Amino acid sequence: SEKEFVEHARKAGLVIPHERLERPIHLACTAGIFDAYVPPEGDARISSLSKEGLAQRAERLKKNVASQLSIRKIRESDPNFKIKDFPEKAKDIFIEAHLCLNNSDHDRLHTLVTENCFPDMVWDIRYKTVRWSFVESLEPPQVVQVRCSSLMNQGNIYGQVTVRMHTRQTLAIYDRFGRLMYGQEDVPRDVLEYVVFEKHLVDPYGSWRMHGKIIPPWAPPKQPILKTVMIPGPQLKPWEEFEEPQ
């Protein structure tokens, strides 16, 4: 008669077990972004100008003091690094990383995107079906700025490169039942992004990995979704009356 149940699952955390790790956790990439680049509000109109856009961006590279120090830091840490050749490598990484999501291959995506970027592009589309393609690139990519941070705890240096890319993409997200959800397939919408890359310099391997994606505050709103949503009203307990803010 004396038989009872087992296996009740709960997640409990304390400070003591976390401080008793014999081998400290090793992080391949930093968590946050050191400095967020602030593009001027006129980039939506400068992008239609060829000479003005290229010349202005080139000056910003050669005039920043902190950026030039970071560029020299990468050169000293690792030779054979060229700023001119970087955007073509960054452009190919961007295309390859998204094509991995189309094929839902996670093994390749781990090498392309970083640890802080992987959950954002996988979590939501885990059970969905997306179809992403590249058609054109109206403006060649430009390097915006380069930053570095020296963590004296272990001597690790991370080199973040911010790249502004004007891309023409065709995005269509399908529901798990096979019905269309977000966008069409044959519309080449023009999109602009400020992709931030990251590379570990102390690591002898040190692959170039995409770190984050920065959207300008004044960016146009994204295309509306097909599904209709309803924002629920405030749940009211019986002894509380509704108040209308104005």
Binding site: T129, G178, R179
Partner: peptide, 18 residues
Amino acid sequence: NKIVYPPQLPGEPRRPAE
């Protein structure tokens, strides 16, 4: 709930949710 169906071709009847 983890079964993912292939995308539907246009013109096919809308698949009801389950």
